[PDB]
Design a protein around this nucleic acid. Sequence first.
DNA 1: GCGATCAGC
DNA 2: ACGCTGATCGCA
Length: 579
Amino acid sequence: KMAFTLADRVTEEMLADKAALVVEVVEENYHDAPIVGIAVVNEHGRFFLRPETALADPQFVAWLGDETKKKSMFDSKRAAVALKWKGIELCGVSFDLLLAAYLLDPAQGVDDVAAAAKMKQYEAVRPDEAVYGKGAKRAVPDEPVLAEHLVRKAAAIWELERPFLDELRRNEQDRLLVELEQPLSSILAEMEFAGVKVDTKRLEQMGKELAEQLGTVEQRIYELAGQEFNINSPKQLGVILFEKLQLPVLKKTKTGYSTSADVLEKLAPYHEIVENILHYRQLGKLQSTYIEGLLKVVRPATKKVHTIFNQALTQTGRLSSTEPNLQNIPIRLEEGRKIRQAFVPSESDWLIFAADYSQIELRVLAHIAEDDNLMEAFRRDLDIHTKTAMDIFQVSEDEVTPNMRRQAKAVNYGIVYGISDYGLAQNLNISRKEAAEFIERYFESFPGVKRYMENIVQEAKQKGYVTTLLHRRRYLPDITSRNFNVRSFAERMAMNTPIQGSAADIIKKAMIDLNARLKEERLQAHLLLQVHDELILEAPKEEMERLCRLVPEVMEQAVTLRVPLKVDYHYGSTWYDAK
DNA sequence: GCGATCAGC
DNA sequence: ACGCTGATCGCA
Ligand SMILES: Nc1nc2c(ncn2[C@H]2C[C@H](O)[C@@H](COP(=O)(O)NP(=O)(O)OP(=O)(O)O)O2)c(=O)[nH]1
Ligand SMILES: [Mn+2]
């Protein structure tokens, strides 16, 4: 129903200097995944290419790598990483429909060409789920069905570039796509393909000690409970805690008693068993998610793990990391922090380098709110986390422990993002009247922040959306909702995403400037991970001293704000040691 | 599959 | 009744 050439070989007209390209990878995790077919649409027509002959054709391979041959794609990082696993480099991607739809509206959840095409009333293409199926019935169709689907997806990309670029221009997002998101897409592909070396023997050893330590706490729980039960079962746990031991019921779920960590901690004065349960869950958390889960996805031949950074998922412009999630590796507890010791450099005599912003969101907030006191505080390079901990616990700076500072961290972010006196009272275990007075004192010291949070909520009502400094956008229709609860959640989003999203923009530009700087200096250093406000690199030890002056300055100079940006940096033999 | 729960930023 | 996530697992 759409004409296309089911090609046997590669011809010259398939190698035009502009084309829409589809390199289809159906596997969810595209690392070392098969490429099932290729489609090319250009000024000379539409073509389908079997990959086993196109990826062996030297003319087609050189065309993929020629950055002067411009390609329009959807989810180009997926194709670039899958081609890297084939030994092939993809260059010249000038338009990515996935990232263009993500900037226009992150709430659409665009996951295939059809979903993005529907935004511009283009429907001459079927959803991937309709072609490949779901679950156990998911399979690659036969060639005449697969070929048309890929050709129709390429033809859609061919027709949709101009309408998407036009709306991006109106939204002041054209530079956000071409100079930020798309260059970052190539960087993340290099990071994902590089992987991170893992000391599997160190993990496997911890897994044996965790299993023997779990049983010790397990029997102490059975002894404290008086009987044996399924500690992971909410039904039996609720019966042991709130029926047999008759502990107070502080919170309910839709299904029964709540046993979250905040509940168990308030029950600590009532029985010893709740703290053993907390320690029991924490050991099981490390065992299930970070010992077993990490060893399951590690590449045995290289001892490397290859995460996937989802660039078009979060509503604020952050990244996310899946299978494995390398953005939530434990650190706050010392027994769980040891897992970062298993993340090691990929070569001998290389080291791990980690740099991170100091309170980037609060400094971003100070610049945007133009609050005199908050700006002055960061011009003094004050640690607002420590200062707030001093005011809360009524101590001096030398008396503030890292545990108190982490609590003040939630107070600083909580207050600026709309926490209530009720919520602050429950987080600090203080009276609700003390919380309201403390929030009152917090806003009289920073009246520009309170002014900004009121103005940004009102601007979201008038425009219907909020923006970040680099013009990333998030629509908030619920901010005019007739329901109080629904509207209140939307109001806190209006307070948060311009600040969290602007911090995501800044580090995204920092990664782009860093790689150009590294290439300029002809260094072997390269990025490994991004953890929201942290950059983790590996490099030969001979490059560490150059990086101590290069990486912080690049990150601090990504943008220029009314307050400076401060970057902390450490290096060591493991990720654990890089702090 | 969903939701409670928990690891991170 | 601060925000943004992903993985695990019992199933009330
Ligand atoms: N709304 C909210 N955002 C948070 C929270 N925690 C972290 N974020 C988000 C906000 C920011 O985007 C980032 C800050 O996380 P860190 O690096 O752990 N703390 P910082 O860098 O300020 O101080 P230092 O590094 O010296 O310890 O993660 C929170 O409790 N609430
Ligand atoms: Mn930080």
